[model samples]
Target: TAQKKPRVLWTHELHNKFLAAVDHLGVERAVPKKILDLMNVDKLTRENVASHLQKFRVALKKVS
Candidate 1:
């Protein structure tokens, strides 16, 4: 079940969409890098999204 970790990745658009959707849904918090990566299975494959949020997250974490 959850053990089936799919190929995880993110693009800018996916990040934007996810943020917007999450905001709309009233979800606010410092979501960890891993959560974003794991969500890519649903976003990229199921929802057909493309974003570089994973890359952005990695970069942002390194910055501060």
Candidate 2:
């Protein structure tokens, strides 16, 4: 059987969880390593959060 590819898109629910971590812990404290622990979502990893963080900060910058 063929192996399934990992998901690339971040779901709205996941994004909300991401924001929640930042809200509660603040951006500096809520690093990707910590976000992954706070999220506690199945199969979620540090790398996943790190990648999202890179773009998330960019989006925030563009908006501000």
Candidate 3:
């Protein structure tokens, strides 16, 4: 039997935690590596934080 990899789903809880970490650090100072530690999300990587940060930045653009 083949072992399947676990799926990576960003749930509301995890997103909220990410948002909180970003808020605490502020947008300008939110480093992906630091955020990975701050977020404390299991299985979360620097790449994942960076990608989410990109999306967040775009959304901020629409708001301003």
Candidate 4:
């Protein structure tokens, strides 16, 4: 029961906004669902942010 997977590329535009959203909430309060809504990009999904965090999470740790 597999499904087709599509790609949504992230760019500098989305990156800055994404960083700001996480900073607004902070890692302790930041959440995939919340960040996704804060992002508010049409067609964006929670799983996208969840996957994104795999990298961003490291950034937050490095910055802290």
lDDT value for model 3:
0.78
Give the per-residue Cα lDDT of candidate 1 at 37: 55
Task: Show where candidate 4 strays beyond 4 Å.
Answer: 1-8, 55-64
Determine which window of 10 residues in candidate 4 has minimal summed lDDT.
2-11
TM-score, every prediction: 0.32, 0.64, 0.66, 0.66
> Taking the tens digit of each residue's C-alpha lDDT, what string does model 3 give over 1-64?
9544464347666678778888899968878899889766568889988987788779888894
> Candidate 4 overall Cα lDDT vs. reference?
0.78
| Candidate 1 lDDT, 1-64, residue by residue in tens | 5443345344554466567655654544434343445355443553232234356657878794
Q: TM-score for candidate 4, please give it.
A: 0.66
RMSD of each: 10.4, 5.7, 5.9, 8.3
Every candidate's lDDT: 0.48, 0.78, 0.78, 0.78
* Positional deviation of residue 44's Cα in model 4 after best superposition, in angstroms: 0.9
Residue-level lDDT of model 2, residues 1-64, one tens digit each, is 9545455246666678788888888887677887789888778899988987798778988794
Q: Assess the local accuracy of residue 48 in candidate 3 as a C-alpha lDDT between 0 and 100.
A: 86
1 versus 2: better lDDT goes to: 2
In Å, residue 32's CA in model 4 sits off its true spot by: 1.1
- Candidate 2 Cα lDDT to native: 0.78
Candidate 1 lDDT at 46 equals: 31
